[PDB]
Symmetry: C3
Subunit: 390 residues, 3 copies
């Protein structure tokens, strides 16, 4: 039929997407690393319960008890000797030692007797009239374990520290063993089996103009800005040939290594994952619908060109075949038998990789600090009430 | 060659994808917010170790020691004065005060002497015959910090509460400072610098029929059902013009803010992320293969139409050029020089945004409650054994 | 115009993507499950503070105090009776019972008096000359709660255990109640309401050659290797008809259920999510650009074929219409009115599902173990100093 009507004029419009300047580059970096191996941390503790009484009667002003929990933390020498001996050495215990024996409370003891384990007893009595009564009860303990040295930059210089449960960073060197002491405890770290590198290498990062840079290393994921040193517990990163601002760096917060994450935080991460995957379902389904549309259009146009070129559908199927259309849509089939040019510019589609992610927990749950807290709790448990050993 | 054979009849089928009624809408919401700023929480503690003895001999029934750890929590006035003074004020200490001086144990003390810090000593002795012996040792401490007010709805009314480590929700008002006391401790919060909003705004949510609604705000991600108030620690959300069911709301579980997440929980979230990314790799690779197929088909069909229209490949390349096919596939090139209609209905592809996610930790690790726990632990540490100060 | 120049020869190249042997299969598995329901765990504790003194003067060697905190954990019978009674039963308390009454310190008490709650007092005095002074103060407590039985395989045999805060796995059977005791505490679990299944079923997993297998169940996500039993807290999985290596299995680490995740771990998971979503933005945007390209090419080619077939654009639009091109691009419109063959091989696009993920926290925050720790802390709080009750 058709008309002399010419209700136009029309012109096909191309689909134009909103551009995105995102791309996956290699970024050259100076990377300062640190790794530790083997039993490199040794913790010892030792203390004496000394209860020294005198019984001169209610009338004597010297009657009474002077007690004390004397801390006797081991020396570096003694802590090493314990470390190879697997025993903590100690002085003598004394129960109900009165009169001349009570002087054992004031002798400079030799730490002779060594133990697999030793807890003290809160002994005290004063029932020997006109005499002194001495009670002496020792406790000691030792654990050898593996500590993880971490990094920190202050003044622009990356140095090694050991984080303690209360947040104090213990400066650590890499040649000589570091040894320190708090009250009853003595700690010894030896830098053997520990390595601190500085390395010219590369990182696979996503550059995306708001440019931001989203980078990955081993199990760490982090933004890597320009002219700023990015420090994470065991690795710092700098852009090669870029000038770090001396201080004001991007460094890990020690608090986040001491403090645990709540169940609400992780559930919130799960919910964010759900929201994200909803977005991904939307986008992927939209692309799916697009391929449906292109399928329809390409089919109609294939019908149009095919009625002219009967060898078209054949090469389309890879089958040696010619067609004859008995219908606008239905057709029948019969058989019988340089430079490249790319019209599409399709590039390699980046498939997301499986993410190695580090989960290490809080510092208080490290074996050594757990041992320290356990020791303190045992001391509290055993000082609950005085025991009469006479 | 070809045959009179007509092994058909065939008909091209269009690709039909499984539909998905997912879409990203703006949802109008009434949102109740709350924000806090500055040092708004003040914690003080104060107590007296009073050891009051009398020495009348083994025969006197009055001989012995009455000791007590009297809690003396500061008043709101005294806590404010400490807050501006940066010192905790206290009464007098007394070591080995016997006879007439021992009466200091029973005088109504004036809290005169103020401290940067103060811990008591467990002094006790009774060696003054026919006399009383008084020992008095004070302890006090103060910390000014920043607390985060949270929201809770019971009876349909959204109100402000302060969560304590044991789970108790302290009702908080926004005009007058709230002050309370537990044993030795006194806490003072002032509502200045704190703001509670109610706001008509919008949220970007994913609506997807099983309709569910997956919503995001600041660092919070949450389902927003119909006719139900959704409360999260610092923000509640309601559908505008919808009738909340008075109670039975969707509110955050206080437990999940007090209790930490295990390493197994987070590792499990990581594994779920891995499973998810495997699905995404599958889908994206499938789409990739689809573009390969369309590339092949479009190339063959382009060859078919090009042998008829020699200006086709030119406009395909944007190059001014005509072709001549010396082969079914090989060809040669030479140069020389309204309403819109959209066949594709391609819409803007939603690219997933980078997710702002809140990670705040457990309540016990808040600075103030950490200070309280530290104070209690110090008190335990110093009450381990009696010290004779005579 | 055009030339006798034939600057070729060219040939269209098809887009070839890098293949990926990833696919979503059903894996047949033998799955050992375990579920618990109702109040199935009962915790009781009970202890006696016994301070037994004698006052014979400074001269008598028998003068002094023998004190003790005697643990008296309930029996299985008594713990069950408490469980149904909601009261913990106890012996008699005694304050300042001297002379003949002091013998109550050494009578075999009958646990007659029962309590909603009971804490002891550290009473001690010795002011009755030539007499004994007895102080007796009891404490008891009971909590009924819900414990979650977990699985563990050693020797290839999957068995049920109850994890305790210090990491010890308590072997649990499914018929008779299990009962054990530590110092002051007694615990009773009854296996009623608890179920341990072994089941032939299937899992939806992603098989992807490096083949690895990434699987999901309820809220658990885990790799399921070949010929290895994969144990998770409440469910183990084995490939059907495959031979598990007797031991050396892939089992959950008990530590990760006792130890919490740091805020740095979760923030790191967030950053990994950001990196991932950057990759997804890149890929999705690339596919978008691809559809733009195909839109352009298909439009030009549609113009080429349309000037020959004026019914083409009509069937392309589903509109009954014929075209006439007054321009290389502009055109005008007028109206008036078997086996299937698939050229594309497009398959069902897998849309990622919303991930159910379990977040359970640490074992120490379970209600029962929280109750135990609270009880111990109360005992510590009340033993701080002796109180004279005379
Ligand atoms: C895209 O990125 C390049 C660097 O690769 C930059 O030169 C250009 O300005 C950017 N353009 C836009 C629009 O982001
Ligand atoms: C942390 O502990 C160390 C060692 O006992 C001590 O020197 C330091 O002052 C403590 N710091 C804090 C903030 O508690
Ligand atoms: C799709 O969503 C619309 C609302 O946008 C609703 O009216 C319709 O029933 C839905 N259809 C299906 C099949 O989900
Ligand atoms: C929490 O502590 C407050 C203040 O000491 C107290 O009033 C309340 O009873 C406690 N609640 C619980 C469940 O421990
Ligand atoms: C692809 O997977 C099949 C099993 O489905 C396997 O037989 C084949 O070797 C694999 N090929 C490649 C290249 O991965
Ligand atoms: C854990 O506690 C149980 C019960 O008190 C005890 O038998 C076991 O030895 C403890 N194990 C460790 C490693 O502390």
């Amino acid at each position: 039929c058709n008309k002399a009507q010419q209700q136009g004029p029309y012109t096909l419009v191309d689909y134009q997407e909103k551009p995105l300047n995102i791309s996956r580059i290699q970024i050259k970096v100076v990377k300062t690393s640190v790794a530790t191996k083997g039993l490199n941390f040794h913790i010892g503790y030792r203390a004496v319960w000394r209860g020294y009484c005198y019984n001169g009667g209610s009338l004597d002003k010297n009657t009474g008890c002077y007690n004390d929990l004397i801390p006797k933390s081991p020396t570096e020498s003694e802590l090493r000797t314990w470390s190879k001996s697997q025993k903590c050495c100690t002085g003598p215990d004394a129960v109900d030692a009165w009169g001349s024996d009570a002087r054992i409370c004031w002798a400079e003891w030799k730490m002779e007797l060594c133990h697999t384990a030793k807890e003290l007893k809160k002994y005290s009595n004063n029932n020997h009239f006109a005499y002194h009564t001495c009670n002496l009860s020792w406790r000691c303990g030792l654990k050898s374990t593996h500590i993880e040295v971490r990094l920190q930059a202050s003044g622009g210089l990356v140095s090694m520290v050991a984080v303690m449960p209360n947040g104090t960073l213990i400066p650590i060197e890499g040649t000589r063993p570091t040894y320190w002491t708090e009250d009853s405890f003595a700690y010894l770290y030896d830098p053997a089996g520990t390595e601190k590198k500085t390395e010219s290498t590369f990182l696979w990062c996503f550059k995306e103009h708001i440019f931001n840079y989203y980078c990955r290393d081993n199990g760490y994921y982090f933004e890597l800005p320009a002219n700023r040193l990015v420090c994470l517990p065991t690795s710092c990163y700098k852009r090669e040939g870029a000038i770090v601002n001396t201080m004001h760096p991007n460094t890990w917060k020690v608090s986040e290594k001491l403090h645990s994450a709540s169940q609400f935080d992780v559930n919130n991460v799960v919910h964010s994952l759900v929201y994200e995957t909803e977005g991904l379902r939307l986008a992927l389904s939209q692309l799916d619908h697009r391929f449906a549309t292109l399928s329809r259009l390409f089919n109609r146009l294939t019908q149009s060109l095919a009625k002219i070129d009967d060898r078209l559908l054949g090469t389309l199927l890879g089958q040696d075949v010619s067609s004859k259309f008995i219908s606008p849509t239905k057709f029948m089939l019969s058989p019988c038998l340089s430079q490249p040019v790319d019209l599409y510019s399709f590039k390699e589609l980046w498939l997301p990789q499986l993410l190695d992610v580090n989960v290490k927990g809080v510092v208080a749950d490290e074996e050594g600090w757990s041992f320290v807290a356990q020791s303190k709790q045992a001391l509290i448990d055993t000082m609950t009430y005085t025991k009469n050993g006479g």
